[PDB]
Design a protein. Sequence first.
Lengths: 516, 103, 103
Amino acid sequence: DGVGNASGDWHCDSTWMGDRVVTKSTRTWVLPSYNNHQYREIKSGSVDGSNANAYFGYSTPWGYFDFNRFHSHWSPRDWQRLINNYWGFRPRSLRVKIFNIQVKEVTVQDSTTTIANNLTSTVQVFTDDDYQLPYVVGNGTEGCLPAFPPQVFTLPQYGYATLNRDNTENPTERSSFFCLEYFPSKMLRTGNNFEFTYNFEEVPFHSSFAPSQNLFKLANPLVDQYLYRFVSTNNTGGVQFNKNLAGRYANTYKNWFPGPMGRTQGWNLGSGVNRASVSAFATTNRMELEGASYQVPPQPNGMTNNLQGSNTYALENTMIFNSQPANPGTTATYLEGNMLITSESETQPVNRVAYNVGGQMATNNQSSTTAPATGTYNLQEIVPGSVWMERDVYLQGPIWAKIPETGAHFHPSPAMGGFGLKHPPPMMLIKNTPVPGNITSFSDVPVSSFITQYSTGQVTVEMEWELKKENSKRWNPEIQYTNNYNDPQFVDFAPDSTGEYRSTRPIGTRYLTRPL
Amino acid sequence: DGVGNASGDWHCDSTWMGDRVVTKSTRTWVLPSYNNHQYREIKSGSVDGSNANAYFGYSTPWGYFDFNRFHSHWSPRDWQRLINNYWGFRPRSLRVKIFNIQV
Amino acid sequence: DGVGNASGDWHCDSTWMGDRVVTKSTRTWVLPSYNNHQYREIKSGSVDGSNANAYFGYSTPWGYFDFNRFHSHWSPRDWQRLINNYWGFRPRSLRVKIFNIQV
C-alpha cells in the first residue's frame, strides 16, 4: 500500500485449549548484501590432519530463515507446564508472515559513513516447495530465531557442498550447480508483505515419560515359573535341571530384549579421576565412507550415556550445548562449568549403557576333553523382539530433520532428536535486489559496480501442537521440574544488569512415570 | 500506482507440456543518457585499406532491448533435453514486460 | 478352427504415452519330448569337495516359458530413452498368447 502505512502487527503469545496449544513468535531481523551480488565457487583440501574435511561447493548472495529450535516457539514457563502434565506432543500446522520492510543505502565520503532510506529499492522472497534445492535446515547449525523476544538477529548466508573427487578439493562430472534466480520470486517495496502456510504429515507423538519398571523384572515376585533351566553335569557327564523360583530375575525366561548398542569411552566429571594429557581423536568412534574415516558424534539410538548418581558419561553419546552464544571461528578451550551436558538416565530401565560391554556368547564346542567357553561382545544390532526408547528433546534443541531420498531406509528417527519428515517445512530464501552505480558507456561485459545497501524487517511464526494427556493410577507424588536455587545472586532465564539473557540449565521432557 | 509499491515480480522458469515448451526469463538492466540528449550525424571514409568500410549515418539518444540469442531463453540442461529427444522445433508466441523503474 | 487357418499374428512394438509405456514381444519356440514321457528321480552326493552340492529331486516330462529378463521386452534404443529421461519405473500388467501350433 504505502510509505506511511504499516504492513503488519506484533504477535507474541501462547493459547492452551484442551488437547491443542497454539504458539505465536515475532522477531526483528537484519539482512546483509552477501558476496557483493555474486555466486562464488568454494572448496577445501585436508585440514587438522583429516581428508574427511575436504569438500567442493558454491556460496550464494541469498539468506534464509531457520525456526528449528524449541526456544524459538516456547517460553521457559510454558515448557515447564507441558513437561509436568502431558504424556506426549506432536506438530500439526505452520504459518509464516514477513512485513514492515525497510531498505537503507550506506555511503562513505572521506570517512563520514552516512546512512539513508531508499524508498524505491526491492527485496526478493521465495519458498522451495518441491525440494529441488539442497536442504541445510536440519543439521544443528546457528542462525535460528532467538530465545528472547527483544533480541535482534542477522540472517545466515546460504551455501552447499556437492561431490568432491578422491577426498580432494576438485569436482566430478556428477557434481551439480544450482541457481536461485532460476526459480520464480515475489518482489517487495516498503509497502509490501509476504505470507506462507504449511501442514505437517502424520507422525508419531514424542514420549514425555520415564519407565517405572525394568525390562528384565516383569514376572510376578510371589509366583514361580512352570519352566526349567540346565544347571549342571554329574561325574559321568549327564545333564541336570532346576525349576525357576519367584523373584530370581537373573535366571527367568524372557519375552523381550533390549535395543542396539556400540561401545563408547566413559569419562568422569566433577570429582572424576580420569587419565592425564590425552588427545581424544585417534581413539574416537568412526564410520568409513568413500575412502575416508568420519567421527559420527551423536551415536545411533538405543543406548544410555549416564547411569544416575554416577559421574561417568559417554561424551560422544551426549548432546553438548553452550549457555551463551559464541563468535564465529572460535578455537578457545572450554571447561565443564561453561558447558551444558545432557543425561539420558531415565531410559536406563530399557537402554543399555554405552561405556560397558553388551553381553556374552559361546565361542567353542564342549567335549569330555574340552571345557565350555564364552566371549564378551562390544557391539550388537537389531534382533526380533527388540524394544528401546528414542533420545529426549530439549528447549535448546532441534524439532525436525529431513529423511534422505535413497529409496531405502529403516526406522526414521534422527540421532540428535525430534521428528523425521519425508516432506519437511520448506526453505525460505531472501535477497537484496542489485541496484547499479553510475554507468556512462556500453559494454558486453557485466556490471560489477553497485550502490551499497542492507535490509531490515519483522517476521511472525505461528505453530499448532497436538497434546496427549496423562491417565496415571499412581497413588504417591511424582518428580517435577522446579525453580530451585540456594542463595541466588541472579534470576535464571532473565536479563542481567548489562541486558544479556542468562540460561544456566538444560531442560528435558521426562518427569512423569508410566508402568511397562 | 506508488513510490512504495512494486510494479512486477521475478519469473525465471521452463514448463514442458507434450508438444509445447514455455520459457520465462527475467533480467536487471541499466540505461545511460546517450549523446547528452542530442542526435548526431556519423560518417566514415576508407579504413584498413578498404572503401567498403565507408558509410554515412545518424547516432541517437535512445537505447533498445535485444533477445535474438538462444542462451537468453534456454538453460544448458534444458537445451540438452531438447537436442537428445526431438526431430524439430519452431517459435509460436512472445510476451514482454518492463517494470520496477528507478531514475 | 482349422488346418488352413492361422491362430494369431506377429506383434513386436513399443508405445510411449505420457506416464505409461507398453512393450510387445513375439518369438518362435521348439519343444522336445523330455524323459520319453516319464518322471525320473534325480539325486546327487558331494561334488568338487562340497556336501552343499548334495540334493534329492524329481525331473519331469514338461517344459516351461520364462520371461524374467529385461532384453526379452526392451530394445537397446528403448532402454536408452528410459535411463536418460526418468527418475523411476515399475511393472503394472502382463498378457500372454500361445498360437500357430505344429506337431
